[PDB]
Enzyme design. Structure first.
Site, PDB file in Angstrom:
ATOM      1  CG  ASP A   1       6.994   4.782   3.160  1.00 29.73           C
ATOM      2  OD1 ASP A   1       7.380   5.083   2.015  1.00 29.73           O
ATOM      3  OD2 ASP A   1       6.164   3.741   3.109  1.00 29.73           O
TER       4      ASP A   1
ATOM      5  CB  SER B   1       5.702  -6.480  -2.871  1.00 32.22           C
ATOM      6  OG  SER B   1       5.941  -6.043  -4.223  1.00 32.22           O
TER       7      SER B   1
ATOM      8  CB  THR C   1      -3.252  -4.961  -2.669  1.00 29.21           C
ATOM      9  OG1 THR C   1      -4.689  -5.023  -2.397  1.00 29.21           O
ATOM     10  CG2 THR C   1      -2.833  -6.595  -2.322  1.00 29.21           C
TER      11      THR C   1
ATOM     12  CE  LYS D   1       3.891   5.618   0.131  1.00 29.07           C
ATOM     13  NZ  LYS D   1       4.382   4.368  -0.828  1.00 29.07           N
ATOM     14  N   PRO D   2       1.913  11.358   0.322  1.00 29.99           N
ATOM     15  CG  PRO D   2       1.280  12.786  -1.455  1.00 29.99           C
ATOM     16  CD  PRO D   2       2.517  12.261  -1.085  1.00 29.99           C
TER      17      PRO D   2
ATOM     18  CG  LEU E   1      -9.655  -0.969   3.432  1.00 38.49           C
ATOM     19  CD1 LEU E   1      -9.500  -0.290   4.851  1.00 38.49           C
ATOM     20  CD2 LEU E   1     -11.109  -0.332   3.054  1.00 38.49           C
TER      21      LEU E   1
END
Length: 339
Positions: free
Chosen positions: A155, A42, A40, A157-158, A38
């Site tokens: 963290d 680092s 990916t 964020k949308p 779903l």
């Protein structure tokens, strides 16, 4: 009200019992079938899986231990799992199992099939103020919960807000979350959402989450973020200036709330004053919000995602499918002893 104070006192008692005695080793890899990648990054991936005996679907986050070590994420990864197994709130994704093997760390979460808020925002362009306000209220209640447990999220964020079958939010990705009484110092977060005191390498506090809520509300209602620029160094220059231009279609109430969340001086920023979260909950922009009804999930959502069932992946995108390899030799055992 005393009812809110007693709710948060119980929430902190239940959190601390699991925090002091974390659950470990509650499933294994060959109890599941792998279905699809779903997303990916680092040092990790998230895969849709199905439990072989019950048939239930889950989102399994897989981290490569050797890569976690090399990218200097040991402490962050231990924070993520220990916090996720101890929290409980309607708008947080639920951790169901965790385990490790010779090569990887695994966190098995409930699967939310409606996709990331980011996909839906970019599709439609921007959200109306009522639609943005419905999601914003859920973030305010979630930050009130987390901050009362002495947790910073770091963290927002949308991409990290998933939309469920009832059109409500579930926050995912606790990779930067941390238990902090007082200040903390790590540089982390996506550039467009960073508070000025993170960019300037200060000892910062929970006020960075209320700054990021201002960026999120702006981006939901405009369609783009307030400090947008082509490269990070230019974004950071805009953030620390804190000059912001608002679209004319924004209401006067929205502009006023955003000037108070996007306040450069952290000692003047809403959420971080003597009255704490209540300066936000009592602001005119939230005058139509029934806070109890939101928590109880009794408000009709603005939008219900389209999907066919609990195994549908159509609201997520396509990635090259790679092996889940497990070495015959144990790697990084000492570093991850407590996981």
């Amino acid at each position: 009200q005393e009812s809110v104070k007693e709710f948060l006192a119980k929430a902190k008692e239940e959190f601390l019992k699991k925090w002091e005695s974390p659950s470990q080793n509650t499933a294994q890899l060959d109890h599941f079938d792998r279905i699809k990648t779903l997303g990916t990054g680092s040092f990790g991936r998230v895969m849709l899986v199905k439990h072989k005996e019950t048939g239930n679907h889950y989102a399994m986050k897989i981290l490569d231990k050797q890569k976690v070590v090399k990218l200097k994420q040991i402490e962050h990864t231990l924070n993520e799992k220990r916090i996720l197994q101890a929290v409980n709130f309607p708008f947080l994704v639920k951790l169901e199992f965790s385990f490790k093997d010779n090569s990887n760390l695994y966190m098995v979460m409930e699967y939310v099939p409606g996709g990331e808020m980011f996909s839906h925002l970019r599709r439609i362009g921007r959200f109306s103020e009522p639609h943005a306000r419905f999601y914003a209220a859920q973030i305010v209640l979630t930050f009130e919960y987390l901050h009362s447990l002495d947790l910073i999220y770091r963290d927002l964020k949308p991409e990290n807000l998933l939309i469920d079958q009832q059109g409500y939010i579930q926050v995912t990705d606790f990779g930067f979350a941390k238990r902090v009484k007082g200040r903390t110092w790590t540089l982390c977060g996506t550039p467009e959402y960073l508070a000025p005191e993170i960019i300037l390498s200060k000892g910062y506090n929970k006020a960075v989450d209320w700054w990021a809520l201002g960026v999120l509300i702006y981006e939901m209602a405009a369609g783009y973020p307030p400090f947008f620029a082509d490269q990070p160094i230019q974004i950071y220059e805009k953030i620390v200036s804190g000059k912001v231009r608002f679209p004319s279609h924004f209401s006067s109430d929205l502009k006023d709330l955003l000037r108070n969340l996007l306040q450069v001086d952290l000692t003047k920023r809403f959420g971080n004053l003597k009255n704490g979260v209540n300066d936000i909950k009592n602001h005119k922009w939230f005058a139509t919000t029934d806070w109890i009804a939101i928590y109880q999930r009794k408000v009709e959502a603005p939008f219900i995602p389209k999907f066919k069932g609990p195994g549908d992946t159509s609201n997520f995108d396509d990635y090259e499918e790679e092996e889940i390899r497990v070495s015959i030799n144990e790697k990084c055992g000492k570093e991850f002893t407590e996981f």
